[PDB]
Subunit: 312 residues, 5 copies
């Protein structure tokens, strides 16, 4: 079995198409995600007679060991894909339709800045292998490419699934090495994050802030320090869901700002008690009345500035 | 070898059937589980027959490789199943008996919106391919669908296992391909969740609610804040086992409501102390007496509303 | 490559035997364990006997293939075993010898009603199908069943390893089969659980109880609530134990009882303070002196009753 | 091919030798450890030496499928090794040199008593399958046995690696009775454990002991109980770097003794406060002054006794 | 297919080149990392020339079963590489161009002292199996070794990727062969570690230090002990990022010093209270005024000494 011979130096055109079936196991630390999907290759197959007799108009069924099947290699994968060939339907003429389910572990970078409200773009790269016949070119068949409407990823919604031609631009560049890029755009569902992570932190912070309406030093110390312990425990709780991230993040900036605010509150309580002991109650009362307005307003301004700095 | 002649008016009918041996490893994060079962097939082929005459005592015949066998592929499986042929028998008329045994991983969605008191459903899909000469359509054998009594999942009780034929031309492909659906219905065993999760949290909340029978500010602060810390630790303990759900469930709503109640209790304690300091004890007494009855009634009403909203 | 023909109707008998090497990885939540062992077989076949005098030998050897070897399969395994044959020797009359080494992971349910002091039984099943017109039944070789003195498992004591001689013949997929049962009996080593779990919780409970000799309300609140937090943290540290179960175990009942005791202690402290504030010190003193004796006696009685219930 | 034929009843001696390279992934809960190492065999092949000639004195190279390769099995591996032949050379006349790089998962018992200051001993067992010719015997070639001196067994320092021949006692067959035993002695580096574990806990205990210089009941209660909570949290922290050991250990004994000391300290504080309230300050002063000296001395004596009991 | 025959005893020089594509999963406990990358060889054949015709200027095409492919084996890998040939093209001159893809699991030593500001150097070793026709010598091809500029290890940056020829230095010199060394230098990105781990601990320590401006024993005890609990909780939180390291580290030294400072602060508070009770407020005030300056200065000097000790 060999590919079709040359006809008139016309470049051989291959119309590929990837039809998604399943997408699962989106691992962040490994920066991978498994896929389970179909694949279609429709290559013009003249000069290989397929019984074009008008009495043989039946669509012929062929096994993999019947003709030359173009072998496409994925660039960013862990191992070679498993070729679970599904069905090949070939007309009495040189027209080819073919479907095959594969499973692979794909490598694709993920950007986790602006983490709870982020979007991603997964990539799949395809190259074609050399052959002794004329040069093989890559083209996209827009009818074949799609998704199964039943692909479910835990916590995301799928926007689009398109394809485009991009030159490989590899340093080897033994030939042109035409390459295909498949882009899967996904968006994270963020609503549950508000009640799960955001509101409890604000409740704890306000419980801490109730110490500006009091004057008992022991009660203030207990309030602020126990609230700090609760904040650390809640950070431990929320650290499990988040992925390990060796760079700065919006949530991390918020956590750091909360730590800073706790430190400043402790300083304010200490100053108030020291003045009250040294008998300057007017100054102590003025400072403790100023704090009640100062803290929430500065917190709001810092949040606005951080939001602008991280979301354009 | 070759497909049977397409002489019969109806398409070549098969008679599938799945007999469960055991199920195991019901993963929740990736929403997949493993299975081990048989797969019996049956169809009629008049091309070969065994007459009772001419020493026709050999009613059955074993043809391992020199025979045409229909091919059945699972749709929602991570990898292709690993099957070993067991037996092949041929009736004197022409009906063929087939049998296998396989293991696989199955991808199936799960719905944890009633996490403790939820019921699931697991699907297995089968597909037969078309052949050029004849036509093949799937069917079910009610005498070959069942399960052992040793099937067990850790924490679930199995209720039923049935089959139903799905329409052809599934998805966008339209090569007259049929599909079969096998449904396994399970229910979670929820009794152990009550004394392990629900009652201790209620005990902690009731312990925190005893601050309404006291007028010592330091004791009230200690009670409420330390019970908040205990609630956070118990939340860590609870979330250890609950699967991670990127959506809103019943338990998350209950936990958020508990956080809100803690916040309101802190506010009430602060207001009472502030009123007492300004030499207005009657108003503070009235407020605390009102809250003593107000808190449990509102908690019960909110619980009733949530229960009606999620289970109705 | 063919089953032997019967003389008149006699079924064929295969004598098996399993010799353990080491058991390990006895997981509790998944209810599985791993094993590697020797598998021995022997069966009668009169179509391959020779003449010892002419052949000059007494036992003729063979290859792993090119001889009719019965299909032996384990019922409750996740995947097929990993086999590597060691020998196939033939007796002069016709009986054959076989040996191989395998490794597998076995599925078996467990019972945790007496979790610290429980005993388990593990089952390994062997089955065989009726091949051709020669029915096959299994038998047990008592001299090929045993285990090494170096068979060890971390934290368990191995008592016996026997095989039930009588098989259970039945019909499956319109064919007859025979099944064998291998039973391994183990018992948990329970000493290390006493100083690691049992005693620290009692010490913390007594530390909590020490608040019946004090009259300061703040100190009592601190003692009881801090000890409750310590109990919750200890339960977090201990939770790496038995999984969720439909039934109620011994340890869960003990933990729930301790929670109830903490709740009642908080109630008593609050009642004493409330009575003291209303200027009725005599009732508070009487209640405290009563509780000093009431709590330990009721705790001991409840422990005795639970011990009788779960082990009687 | 075939093994060399007998010449003068001289047994074939296979001088073996293992050359360790990597010893890693020491998983103690599973009580295994993966190994990556070479393996050299030299079986004398006289009367079958190929191309003995001074002109062709250059060492000859043979592919693995050119000469007979002995089959050596590992007794205590979870699965069969993944062999990788590197280079096998045959002299013009004489012996044959062989070398393969295999990686295997080995199951060996681990004794975790005396955990910080423990020395282990890993074992590998080898057997060789016999053939129809004279019995294959195993002997250790001391010249090839050794290490790469570049073993990445971090946390341990290798002391020796030797071998010896022992009789085999498992399912005796009058053959396969000449197994080998390779012992790898390792010792744990215990310096970092001192600052990482030992000293913080002593600091915490000494912090708790400062309650014997104070007569404030509330301060003493806060000190002792909060110190107990800190001890529980630090135990949680320590438990991560330690496998599940279902048996008694030196560290566990120390931890239990620390819990006992906390309980006794709480008892002493309560007794002192009760005596002070009962208008008997002299007994309280005597008791606290006695405790100041009594506690550290008893702690030191108990530590000495426990050390002598565990370390001989 | 056999290696090229000798021409004039000239060794067949092989110009090797590794072109990186993907580096991922830098697991530290197992001391491994996975590499997905290309590979190239530039051996030529003189006697077995490839089409020395001037009409064949077009580059010929070959497959794996077309020429002799060298046997190059990695030394420090877990198991054999997953070879995946992509291109094998031969020019009419006689030179060969090769392109494959592999994904191996490499074992390379790592050093985690000076952990947040450290650099690493990963090694890959190559050896080629010799043949009896000639002697094979490995030389580095400088036009092939390189990176794809899109290699992403999460949290590192790539400095250089270079190759060098070194002696084998193995104690078992089978054929006096050679070896290659490929070095990849990476430096950790340390910016996020400051806000993530460093500043919160300083804030907590200063919150502890605010107790030298107070004179209430109860408040001081609460501050210091609760701050110690918070420090332990934060250590638990940050333990999930660091690798399990069985040797000393800069961060571990910092943690130990923080524990020591907490112990000394507790001692100082106890001494102050004891003197104040014993009626020496002058001495108490002197010590408490000295501490305010003594503690930060000693902390700074100790940090400077530790930094000099660990960073030369
Ligand atoms: C009452 C008077 C006492 C006040 C005492 C204040 C002490 C302050 C000590 C220094 C803390 C603040 C400076 C922090 C320096 C390090 C920077 C830092 O932590 O920033 C983290 C983080 C974000 O990092 P970016 O630089 O935006 O990252 C994006 C670009 N890669 O900053 C914030 O969250 C700022 C919060 C306000
Ligand atoms: C090094 C990092 C900080 C380590 C030390 C812990 C911080 C302790 C802060 C002390 C606050 C109490 C001092 C106080 O009350 O001073 C009174 C003083 C007035 O003194 P007279 O009554 O005139 O005498 O009141 C003040 O206004 C003091 C200044 C306010 C505090 C300014 C910020 C605190 C210092 C910076 C800490 C963080 C640095 C990073
Ligand atoms: C004061 C003491 C209060 C003690 C309260 C104990 C609460 C445990 C209740 C367990 C019983 C649940 C039960 O019977 O469930 C049956 C039924 C089965 O589900 P379906 O068949 O789908 O029915 C829905 C359609 N009608 O489930 C329900 O109806 C659940 C309704 C809510 C009951 C659970 C109550 C939980 C209360 C949480 C309180 C806060 C805890 C912190
Ligand atoms: C569900 C709703 C329960 C809410 C959970 C918190 C409630 C707190 C329990 C009451 C605290 C103490 C009450 C108190 O001081 O009562 C003393 C008061 C004495 O005052 P007189 O002079 O008789 O008027 O009455 C008593 O002695 C009552 C004794 C028993 C009361 C507690 C019994 C259990 C309460 C409900 C438990 C949960 C069900
Ligand atoms: C956001 C940060 C919130 C921190 C906590 C703020 C509230 C603390 C308590 C306020 C307080 O004591 O107010 C007493 C105040 C003063 O009374 P006069 O004698 O008229 O003066 O009393 C009242 O008016 C009673 C009701 C006060 C409002 C209750 C709080 C409302 C909710 C505030 C936070 C909402 C988010
Ligand atoms: C439940 C725990 C709450 C303790 C208080 C409940 C009783 C309310 C007040 C009863 C009362 O005043 O009794 C008066 C009466 C006599 O008073 P005089 O005037 O001195 O005569 O007091 C008594 O007789 C004292 C004993 C009666 C109250 C019982 C006290 C002990 C309570 C706990 C019992 C053991 C519970 C153990 C745990 C069980 C659940 C896990
Ligand atoms: C194991 C069980 C350990 C717990 C049992 C008690 C051990 C400690 C008792 C030692 C002190 C008793 C003698 C003494 O001097 O007590 C003082 C004084 C009265 O003595 P007079 O006769 O006035 O002299 O008694 C006290 O102060 C009592 C101390 C209370 C603490 C002990 C209670 C602990 C909590 C209950 C534990 C129940 C375990 C079952
Ligand atoms: C008395 C208790 C405090 C002094 C004893 C400290 C014990 C040693 C210790 O903890 O050192 C760890 C640590 C770092 O290790 P080095 O000794 O610098 O070098 C390690 C490689 N050889 O040292 C320190 O903590 C020094 C700062 C105090
Ligand atoms: C090891 C066990 C450690 C237990 C905790 C130690 C607590 C020490 C408190 C001592 C104290 O308050 O002494 C005050 C004491 C009163 O002096 P008079 O003799 O009254 O003059 O003050 C002093 O002596 C000055 C300070 C010396 C104390 C130094 C303590 C060092 C302890 C290190 C242990 C390792
Ligand atoms: Cl591929
Ligand atoms: Cl399949
Ligand atoms: Cl099997
Ligand atoms: Cl092996
Ligand atoms: Cl390799």
């Amino acid at each position: 079995v060999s590919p079709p011979p040359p006809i008139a130096d016309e470049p051989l055109t291959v119309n590929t198409g990837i039809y998604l079936i399943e997408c699962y196991s989106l691992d962040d630390k490994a920066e991978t995600f498994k896929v389970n999907a179909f694949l279609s290759l429709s290559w013009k197959d003249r000069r290989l007679a397929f019984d074009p007799v008008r009495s043989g108009v039946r669509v012929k069924t062929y096994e993999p060991e019947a003709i030359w099947i173009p072998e496409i290699r994925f660039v960013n994968v862990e191992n070679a894909r498993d070729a679970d060939v599904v069905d090949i339907s070939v007309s009495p003429d040189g027209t080819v339709q073919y479907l095959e389910r594969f499973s692979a572990r794909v490598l694709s970078p993920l950007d986790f800045r602006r983490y709870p409200f982020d979007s991603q773009t997964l990539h799949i790269y395809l190259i074609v292998r050399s052959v002794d016949t004329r040069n093989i070119v890559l083209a996209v068949d827009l009818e074949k490419v799609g998704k199964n409407d039943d692909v479910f990823l835990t916590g995301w919604d799928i926007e689009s699934f398109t394809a485009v031609v991009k030159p490989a631009n590899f340093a080897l560049e033994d030939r042109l090495e035409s390459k295909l890029d498949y882009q899967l755009r996904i968006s994270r569902q963020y609503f549950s994050y508000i009640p799960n992570i955001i509101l409890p932190m604000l409740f704890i912070l306000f419980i801490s802030w109730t110490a500006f309406w009091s004057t008992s030093y022991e009660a203030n110390v207990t309030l602020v320090v126990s609230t700090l312990i609760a904040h650390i425990a809640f950070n431990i709780l929320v650290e499990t869901n988040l992925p390990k991230t060796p760079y700065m993040t919006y949530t991390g900036a918020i956590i750091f700002m909360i730590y800073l605010f706790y430190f400043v509150a402790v300083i304010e309580v200490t100053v108030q008690h020291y003045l009250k002991v040294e008998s300057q109650p007017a100054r102590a009362a003025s400072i403790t009345r100023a704090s009640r307005i100062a803290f929430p307003v500065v917190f709001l301004l810092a949040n606005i500035i951080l939001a602008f700095l991280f979301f354009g």
